[model samples]
Target chain A: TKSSAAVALKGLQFVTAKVGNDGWAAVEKRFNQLQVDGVLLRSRFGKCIGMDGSDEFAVQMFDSLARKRGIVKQVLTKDELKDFYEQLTDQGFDNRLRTFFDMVDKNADGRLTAEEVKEIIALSASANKLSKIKERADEYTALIMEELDPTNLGYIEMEDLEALLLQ
Target chain B: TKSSAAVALKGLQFVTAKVGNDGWAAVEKRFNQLQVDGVLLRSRFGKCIGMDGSDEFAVQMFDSLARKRGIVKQVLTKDELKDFYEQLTDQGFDNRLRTFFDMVDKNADGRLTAEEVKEIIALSASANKLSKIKERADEYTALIMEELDPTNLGYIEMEDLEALLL
Candidate 1:
């Protein structure tokens, strides 16, 4: 309950709460319904995971999670789908925070340049339909940089992100 | 313009800028009209300072600015009024930030306990008509404390506040 609520405040929104039991029975059912040829395309991941309205976020997340296992194809097996869903709904804040950050890190380089931060901000603004915030993405990008990248190094690591989020 | 815009993001909203000339011609007029026996009472301070809508905030500010000068009475001479007005409308973030924090520090002790933080958050929420935020003042108070009082001092000073704000 604590992790779920904490994630709600500052993390991506997930429509399902599969926290208890950690069982994949419902997911297996969805996988059976959605999969064709024993594989789920990236486009179908959101509907399978109950993130139907957030298609863009789900697609991006699919790649990030797929990238974690060095999988580059735009398709996932039931095993891979379970791994991705578990990471998204991970009870640990650290794991979920890392995954959320990695969604925008894009290259898995373990560093976030200002451009990466700006694009993430824009994506979030788009997700929330906050057009005003989308327009000010550059301003908020610099705000995050000003707080986290104190040395003017032009990039921030996970530690810097964790410090600001927890701070 | 930069300082004014910066202050708007995280500082108190003063409806009047009065930043260009730094002249007291208009304040003198309000003082002349609002003062009785060449002195303005605490009750009239808000109206005189153009914070007519923010009476509670203006009154708290009057005492904080007056406390800076060791003034005990709830009244201000024209010169003292000018000093208080200047501090509120100061272009530099540091001066106005100090005054804003002083409004809650209450004892001039330069430290804010969680109760003080809760009270200020509640006040701001009320001012903005954000009743939901007002209801969660305790939670938000703890959030601020978690960020600024990491040393577990049970209180935060202006430096910590500045670090969080700017």
Candidate 2:
């Protein structure tokens, strides 16, 4: 149960000093610093490590550090990946994607316009996959064109793209 | 987020299904059955495609199947193992293990009795490290005998172990 113990240890933390006399103020100050440090470390460390390090090393290091600092565990591995897919299937991935597409498509027409595609591309880019953003935008556009109108229709509508993409 | 989701999913099944379905009744009837089917199919597919097949083909196939079934964007990856030793330094590891040994030592005696050793061994066996269990038990006993008995007490007391093992 060392693994479980180590995992549980991740959520514990200690403060270095006090901002104010009271425990509440100290707690608030420490909590805020924890958040800032979490984000800063995630960004800094992500950049420092990049995509080259083995996921195993990354997970172990992350968990180790988190356990030392009493933060939650966040490690990804191959078995975890397979299990996620299985869970998604159980929860109905198709419905979730369709719901997501519906929320983003705004116009609700047949196909997503360039502006809509731009939104998705921006979203994907924000998630750190610039290449995927571009690729998906192009793919979505093609699908829209193929399923919508070959005879030079006014524009692609959301409904058309959704129908094509979902099925 | 995805990693946490996967661990949560794994934990959910582990804690709930394993414990809730005590004696493995519900698990054997429902969860285990499903897992068995999936495992079999996965094993067969793996054999046909070789060791690398399950990791690659299964994910792709599952994703496609999800899409066909009107699902999308569900991705899975493997869970990484944590190294406890690397996580702890000399002081930390020592302190934690000392605390752990004290808690399990029960009788406050320096040396663990055979019964106590058996309990630890059984706990370890549950983790599928039976050999390690036996080895550690022997190591603890030897350490107690060699290091604790400067006065040749012949038997280890709880204090003797706390002095040495801790």
Candidate 3:
């Protein structure tokens, strides 16, 4: 299913921009840089776009993003990180948007429930340090389900997510 | 708790014999080298002084030695490896013999039973690829606890180990 909307990122490099893969043992050193930085590394100068940089969920959220972009592994090595970059470079907006959908739709039913939608929105809100949104989780979830799943089909498909949001 | 046995090893540079570790990133490199050759390195040269190097028991056995030597973390870095060598080199026959007793003592009640004796003996025998010895573990353990624990106290203390063997 091709997305007509732009999903591709304009940037050429992400993780490699901060960590060097320029010389020999670059991969090893890159991993060292990452490990040293640990959870502190934010995806914003292009870490994941919608997630919080400080939470424990960042890793999983990042992994989910990576997988959506055609990158397979989340917990990467110097070698795998290279592969992740390759995938990331090849990815587009649809790919990333699909990734966002998958992140919210953890069960992979190709259908998203309001509960599922709320969980990610809350997590996304938490990642970005917007707890007010989280405090209103049921309200946001209810509004989302009410607006997006208007047909009341009990679940919203990926199309619903893409249409209601991605477009 | 400190009986009169020379448990500290003699040399100060065991891990130093390997990857260079002298500065800020030295410890990191050292661990890199270790991870690169993780399976190859072992408690060699006289760890058991007599056991085989090819068994899973040896890994567990060596790890047991490592833990007692004040090296707490298992996924050791280059620095920790150096610390391991420091402990290893400092260790003597007495330390190892005590280590052996503790290896079997399992519960660390400062004692060893015939059952514990058999188990480790079997493990060591298995590590050395000596099935014949493994088969005789029960016999060896019996002889061991019988001779070592002559006090009929049901276990062998660390001192008991040093005095009987050392």
Candidate 4:
């Protein structure tokens, strides 16, 4: 009983901790250090930009650039960002999203099952929040619609998506 | 006229023709589309290695990594390859070679003129030879070293080099 109570008490103690000063400060410091370390590590590994840390790095960098350019921040989600980059180069960005979908769409259905979406949502939630997770999903879907629709079909066919990705 | 004729007939024309075919087909073809554009215009914009064609992009990226591994073919020059980076991690290299003999003597008694061994070596062909335009400098060094080196020190002189480059 005491052992279980000790565990419960530990959880309670953590809950009672101050929001910013005691609890979030530690968490924020760890996350900030992790962010900086990740950036430095990728820099060491010779990537021009740091690896995508839960896609937040992409969000932050894109947002910062938008801010500097006086563009609306929320207007461009992560998927639209790819579109923006594609527009600059005319190389197409939907193919990249299709590749990503193919990697996770275990059942090989043309459309990602809700289960796949749920798993990815959970993974992204661990890094940030569910809403942000959904935002990324929507972005990817938008990329699927706007750029990857090479056949002019209303929906992405699995084979088409797969072929586009492989190419 | 002979010199110009030799350069045009044998050296410049030959290399130009060869490079156009071989360089583009063998080398340029392998470059990423962005890199091909950058290399084509490298002379006009100076040697840069990142973000398409801008020097600012290359410098910002260079501040992060050492030489990119294996992508580039050439090695950088002496003045171009100084490890000023190690200083950020607390390992300063020697800086003795940077000082002029007049400054190094400390006596100021006119004991060292251009004829003195130390002064002569510093002023003579050895030093000049070391700094001669030898070959196309490596991309990393051209980006980080010679292009950034203001003092013309063969190796980075920590105090002056860092201040000058930064």
What is the lDDT for B126 in model 2?
A: 31
Q: Candidate 1 has what TM-score?
A: 0.35
Model 2 Cα lDDT, one tens digit per residue, B1-166: 2332232223222212221212223322432333332332322322222212124433333333333334333421111001211111123433433333333344444333334333333332232233344454344334434444556545433333223322
- For candidate 4 chain A, the 10 contiguous residues with the lowest summed lDDT are A11-20
TM-score of each: 0.35, 0.17, 0.24, 0.15
Q: How high a TM-score does candidate 3 get? A: 0.24
A-chain TM-score of every model: 0.59, 0.22, 0.38, 0.23
List model 2's recovered fraction of native interface contacts, to 2 decimals: 0.00
Using TM-score as the measure, the top candidate is 1
How many angstroms is residue A120 displaced in model 3 relative to the true structure, after the best TM-score fit? 55
| Model 3 stretches astray by more than 4 angstroms | A1-167, B1-32, B36-52, B69-73, B124-166
Clashes of each: 0, 33, 17, 0
Rank the candidate models, highest lDDT first.
1, 3, 2, 4
> Which ten-residue region of model 1 chain A has the weakest summed lDDT?
A12-21
Q: A1-167, model 3: which lDDT tens digit per residue?
A: 01101111111122212222243354335455554334224332123222223444445545555655565533444444555444434445344444444544565555544345334333332223333323343343444455655666544333343344222
Question: Model 1: runs farther than 4 Å from truth?
Answer: A1-167, B1-23, B130-166
Error of 4 at A32 (Å): 40
Residue-wise C-alpha lDDT for candidate 4, range B1-166, written one tens digit per residue: 2332222123212212211222223332333332442333322111322123234323322332223222232333222222312222221212211122122223334232212222222222122222222221132233333433435444322232223323
Every candidate's lDDT: 0.58, 0.32, 0.39, 0.31
